[PDB]
Amino acid sequence: EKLNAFLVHDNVAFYQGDVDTVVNGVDFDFIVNAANENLAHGGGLAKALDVYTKGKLQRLSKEHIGLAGKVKVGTGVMVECDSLRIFNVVGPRKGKHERDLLIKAYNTINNEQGTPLTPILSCGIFGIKLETSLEVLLDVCNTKEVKVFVYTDTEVCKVKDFVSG
């Protein structure tokens, strides 16, 4: 792959980039979308993925939602957008049962066949601390190779500090 990982920790490798950068720079089988229950890709990573796919992600998501209804928290829906397979995983919001649902969401990713390229779930609007989510990620995803990406230099620093500090 063209993009070098900034850190490899046993079976987990960490990358920095926007969607263009990681999709074109990293060798993976599917990319994880940090989706909401409506698969309504209105902001953040989900918007950037839809933009990358020229709206195909949102159209196929709409077709799924129209038939199946809302996606359950902790579960995923795979959508194939030309050569890019996008696994839409719904992480929990901050709240009492957040850990159990993060464990479920990360197991969903870990159990889906192939090498994932995944964000750290439930950051940003969902309100869960990066390091809290990352701990669950590393605890669950402890066998097959899993690739993790972040966007900003501050996120990179927090990852390095958590794992290596």
mmCIF file of C-alpha atoms in Angstrom:
data_model
loop_
_atom_site.group_PDB
_atom_site.id
_atom_site.type_symbol
_atom_site.label_atom_id
_atom_site.label_comp_id
_atom_site.label_asym_id
_atom_site.label_seq_id
_atom_site.Cartn_x
_atom_site.Cartn_y
_atom_site.Cartn_z
ATOM 1 C CA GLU A 1 0.000 0.000 0.000
ATOM 2 C CA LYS A 2 1.059 3.587 -0.676
ATOM 3 C CA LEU A 3 0.141 5.137 2.702
ATOM 4 C CA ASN A 4 2.427 4.244 5.603
ATOM 5 C CA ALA A 5 0.813 3.418 8.946
ATOM 6 C CA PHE A 6 1.858 5.831 11.724
ATOM 7 C CA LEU A 7 1.765 3.062 14.301
ATOM 8 C CA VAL A 8 1.388 -0.741 14.272
ATOM 9 C CA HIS A 9 0.297 -2.350 17.537
ATOM 10 C CA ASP A 10 0.287 -6.109 17.281
ATOM 11 C CA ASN A 11 -2.536 -6.876 14.779
ATOM 12 C CA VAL A 12 -3.838 -3.262 14.516
ATOM 13 C CA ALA A 13 -2.300 -0.652 12.179
ATOM 14 C CA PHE A 14 -3.182 3.035 12.329
ATOM 15 C CA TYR A 15 -3.350 5.474 9.407
ATOM 16 C CA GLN A 16 -4.014 9.212 9.011
ATOM 17 C CA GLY A 17 -6.023 10.645 6.164
ATOM 18 C CA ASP A 18 -9.273 11.813 4.681
ATOM 19 C CA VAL A 19 -11.409 9.344 2.709
ATOM 20 C CA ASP A 20 -9.716 10.023 -0.649
ATOM 21 C CA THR A 21 -6.357 9.400 0.991
ATOM 22 C CA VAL A 22 -7.194 6.192 2.888
ATOM 23 C CA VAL A 23 -9.338 4.600 0.149
ATOM 24 C CA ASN A 24 -6.540 5.115 -2.401
ATOM 25 C CA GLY A 25 -3.666 4.559 0.098
ATOM 26 C CA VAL A 26 -4.546 1.523 2.211
ATOM 27 C CA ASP A 27 -4.967 -2.167 1.329
ATOM 28 C CA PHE A 28 -8.266 -3.355 2.887
ATOM 29 C CA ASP A 29 -11.305 -5.502 2.026
ATOM 30 C CA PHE A 30 -14.030 -3.154 3.277
ATOM 31 C CA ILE A 31 -14.134 0.349 4.787
ATOM 32 C CA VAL A 32 -16.346 0.979 7.830
ATOM 33 C CA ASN A 33 -18.747 3.930 7.764
ATOM 34 C CA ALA A 34 -19.603 5.460 11.172
ATOM 35 C CA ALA A 35 -23.290 5.535 10.285
ATOM 36 C CA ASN A 36 -26.535 6.568 11.996
ATOM 37 C CA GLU A 37 -29.588 4.349 12.213
ATOM 38 C CA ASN A 38 -31.221 5.993 9.170
ATOM 39 C CA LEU A 39 -28.116 5.430 6.993
ATOM 40 C CA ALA A 40 -28.548 9.164 6.323
ATOM 41 C CA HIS A 41 -24.982 10.227 5.482
ATOM 42 C CA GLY A 42 -25.385 13.929 6.280
ATOM 43 C CA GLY A 43 -22.097 14.876 7.910
ATOM 44 C CA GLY A 44 -18.558 13.912 8.887
ATOM 45 C CA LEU A 45 -17.029 10.710 7.582
ATOM 46 C CA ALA A 46 -20.364 9.387 6.236
ATOM 47 C CA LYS A 47 -20.851 12.522 4.106
ATOM 48 C CA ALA A 48 -17.227 12.284 2.823
ATOM 49 C CA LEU A 49 -17.786 8.625 1.845
ATOM 50 C CA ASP A 50 -20.995 9.506 0.037
ATOM 51 C CA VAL A 51 -19.156 12.302 -1.814
ATOM 52 C CA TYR A 52 -16.368 9.833 -2.730
ATOM 53 C CA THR A 53 -18.949 7.409 -4.183
ATOM 54 C CA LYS A 54 -20.707 10.310 -6.036
ATOM 55 C CA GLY A 55 -23.928 9.651 -4.109
ATOM 56 C CA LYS A 56 -24.046 5.871 -4.760
ATOM 57 C CA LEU A 57 -23.626 5.127 -1.058
ATOM 58 C CA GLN A 58 -26.657 7.239 -0.138
ATOM 59 C CA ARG A 59 -28.839 5.816 -2.945
ATOM 60 C CA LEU A 60 -28.104 2.179 -1.989
ATOM 61 C CA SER A 61 -28.513 3.079 1.694
ATOM 62 C CA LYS A 62 -31.971 4.597 0.897
ATOM 63 C CA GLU A 63 -32.936 1.422 -0.981
ATOM 64 C CA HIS A 64 -31.951 -0.730 2.050
ATOM 65 C CA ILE A 65 -33.707 1.541 4.582
ATOM 66 C CA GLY A 66 -36.861 1.663 2.406
ATOM 67 C CA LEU A 67 -37.171 -2.137 2.575
ATOM 68 C CA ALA A 68 -35.667 -3.003 5.981
ATOM 69 C CA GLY A 69 -36.232 0.048 8.198
ATOM 70 C CA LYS A 70 -33.725 1.558 10.665
ATOM 71 C CA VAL A 71 -30.401 -0.150 11.377
ATOM 72 C CA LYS A 72 -30.065 -1.453 14.947
ATOM 73 C CA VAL A 73 -27.364 0.123 17.145
ATOM 74 C CA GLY A 74 -24.382 -2.240 17.228
ATOM 75 C CA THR A 75 -25.176 -3.820 13.846
ATOM 76 C CA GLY A 76 -23.984 -3.216 10.278
ATOM 77 C CA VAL A 77 -25.161 -3.146 6.685
ATOM 78 C CA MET A 78 -22.722 -3.758 3.822
ATOM 79 C CA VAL A 79 -23.199 -1.661 0.653
ATOM 80 C CA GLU A 80 -21.113 -2.282 -2.507
ATOM 81 C CA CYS A 81 -20.249 0.940 -4.387
ATOM 82 C CA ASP A 82 -18.415 -0.127 -7.543
ATOM 83 C CA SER A 83 -15.001 -1.419 -6.298
ATOM 84 C CA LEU A 84 -15.494 -0.066 -2.744
ATOM 85 C CA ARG A 85 -17.352 -2.117 -0.132
ATOM 86 C CA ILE A 86 -18.693 0.050 2.674
ATOM 87 C CA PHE A 87 -19.781 -1.515 5.947
ATOM 88 C CA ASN A 88 -22.205 0.860 7.600
ATOM 89 C CA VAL A 89 -21.898 0.281 11.358
ATOM 90 C CA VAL A 90 -24.067 2.125 13.917
ATOM 91 C CA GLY A 91 -22.180 2.911 17.083
ATOM 92 C CA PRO A 92 -23.909 3.991 20.299
ATOM 93 C CA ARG A 93 -24.213 7.504 21.708
ATOM 94 C CA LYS A 94 -22.740 8.365 25.106
ATOM 95 C CA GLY A 95 -24.893 6.769 27.813
ATOM 96 C CA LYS A 96 -25.195 4.068 30.495
ATOM 97 C CA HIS A 97 -25.005 1.023 28.182
ATOM 98 C CA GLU A 98 -22.455 2.552 25.775
ATOM 99 C CA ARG A 99 -19.751 -0.068 26.512
ATOM 100 C CA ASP A 100 -21.929 -3.094 25.802
ATOM 101 C CA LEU A 101 -23.059 -1.501 22.506
ATOM 102 C CA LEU A 102 -19.477 -0.572 21.521
ATOM 103 C CA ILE A 103 -18.462 -4.161 22.176
ATOM 104 C CA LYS A 104 -21.315 -5.298 19.915
ATOM 105 C CA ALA A 105 -20.399 -2.782 17.170
ATOM 106 C CA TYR A 106 -16.718 -3.758 17.216
ATOM 107 C CA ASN A 107 -17.642 -7.472 17.186
ATOM 108 C CA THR A 108 -19.793 -6.747 14.132
ATOM 109 C CA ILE A 109 -16.698 -5.323 12.421
ATOM 110 C CA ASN A 110 -14.383 -8.091 13.717
ATOM 111 C CA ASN A 111 -16.786 -10.844 12.611
ATOM 112 C CA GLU A 112 -17.395 -9.482 9.093
ATOM 113 C CA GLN A 113 -15.143 -11.414 6.672
ATOM 114 C CA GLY A 114 -12.112 -9.482 5.445
ATOM 115 C CA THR A 115 -9.615 -6.860 6.545
ATOM 116 C CA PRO A 116 -11.538 -3.820 7.830
ATOM 117 C CA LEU A 117 -10.354 -0.228 7.497
ATOM 118 C CA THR A 118 -12.325 1.463 10.293
ATOM 119 C CA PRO A 119 -12.657 4.761 12.123
ATOM 120 C CA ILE A 120 -12.783 4.832 15.910
ATOM 121 C CA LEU A 121 -16.553 4.614 16.490
ATOM 122 C CA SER A 122 -18.872 6.997 18.387
ATOM 123 C CA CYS A 123 -16.495 9.969 18.461
ATOM 124 C CA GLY A 124 -17.674 13.409 17.453
ATOM 125 C CA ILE A 125 -21.434 14.009 17.665
ATOM 126 C CA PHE A 126 -22.102 10.623 19.311
ATOM 127 C CA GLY A 127 -20.073 11.960 22.244
ATOM 128 C CA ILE A 128 -17.899 9.012 23.343
ATOM 129 C CA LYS A 129 -14.274 9.727 24.260
ATOM 130 C CA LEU A 130 -11.770 8.610 21.610
ATOM 131 C CA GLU A 131 -9.619 6.694 24.108
ATOM 132 C CA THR A 132 -12.715 4.942 25.547
ATOM 133 C CA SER A 133 -13.796 3.699 22.114
ATOM 134 C CA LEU A 134 -10.223 2.825 21.104
ATOM 135 C CA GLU A 135 -9.798 0.671 24.197
ATOM 136 C CA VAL A 136 -12.784 -1.432 23.188
ATOM 137 C CA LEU A 137 -11.528 -1.573 19.620
ATOM 138 C CA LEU A 138 -8.137 -3.034 20.702
ATOM 139 C CA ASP A 139 -9.759 -5.408 23.208
ATOM 140 C CA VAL A 140 -12.242 -6.878 20.683
ATOM 141 C CA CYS A 141 -10.074 -6.808 17.527
ATOM 142 C CA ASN A 142 -7.273 -8.948 18.863
ATOM 143 C CA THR A 143 -6.741 -11.554 16.109
ATOM 144 C CA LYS A 144 -7.193 -10.723 12.378
ATOM 145 C CA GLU A 145 -5.432 -7.647 10.968
ATOM 146 C CA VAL A 146 -7.585 -4.523 11.493
ATOM 147 C CA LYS A 147 -6.714 -1.124 10.061
ATOM 148 C CA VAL A 148 -7.845 2.030 11.841
ATOM 149 C CA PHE A 149 -7.872 5.582 10.465
ATOM 150 C CA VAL A 150 -8.134 9.046 11.947
ATOM 151 C CA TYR A 151 -8.284 12.425 10.281
ATOM 152 C CA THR A 152 -6.633 15.102 12.428
ATOM 153 C CA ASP A 153 -3.156 15.556 13.961
ATOM 154 C CA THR A 154 -4.779 15.756 17.423
ATOM 155 C CA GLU A 155 -6.447 12.385 16.895
ATOM 156 C CA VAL A 156 -3.076 10.946 15.824
ATOM 157 C CA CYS A 157 -1.467 12.297 18.994
ATOM 158 C CA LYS A 158 -4.199 10.799 21.214
ATOM 159 C CA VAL A 159 -3.831 7.416 19.537
ATOM 160 C CA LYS A 160 -0.047 7.403 19.960
ATOM 161 C CA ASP A 161 -0.341 8.584 23.594
ATOM 162 C CA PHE A 162 -2.951 5.929 24.440
ATOM 163 C CA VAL A 163 -1.198 2.969 22.838
ATOM 164 C CA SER A 164 2.460 3.954 23.245
ATOM 165 C CA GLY A 165 2.507 6.467 26.147
#
